[PDB]
Design a protein around this nucleic acid. Structure first.
Length: 49
DNA sequence: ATAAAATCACCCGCACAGATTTTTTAAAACGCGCCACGGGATTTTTAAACCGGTATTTAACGGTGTATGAATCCCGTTTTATCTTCCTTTCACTTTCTTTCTCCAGT
């Protein structure tokens, strides 16, 4: 952490494709993102395919 | 000094609706000119009124069976009369800045 007295995970070991099913939206310097949500069953079927 | 409840400015990308701002275009206008058109004075011809008569074609009249016009009752629409308001304006007051007049200690 900032004081060097704790530990924080670098990334989560997720079982869910969260990015596609929930989307995202943010504004940065020189760029931006905009992603719509989706349906979980269709994403799972696509991953299996 | 402990409790209860509230409010606002800016940064970073991107897409779009709305508000100016040039730019182009069609209508209105002006000056000059010429010839198409209408006025005036003869020739010509034909549309309609007038006499017949005849042969149809219409309107006024007497029964039935409706469709609608005036009256009543409402509710959205638009006018008109009637309140409050923010900028213009001065203006007497207040405040604040600039120059001047002394004091005055020192030598």
């Amino acid at each position: 952490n900032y004081d060097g007295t704790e530990k924080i995970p670098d990334v989560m070991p997720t079982k869910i494709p969260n990015l596609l099913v929930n989307g995202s939206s943010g504004i940065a310097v020189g760029m931006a993102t905009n992603i719509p949500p989706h349906n979980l069953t269709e994403v799972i079927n696509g991953c299996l395919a």
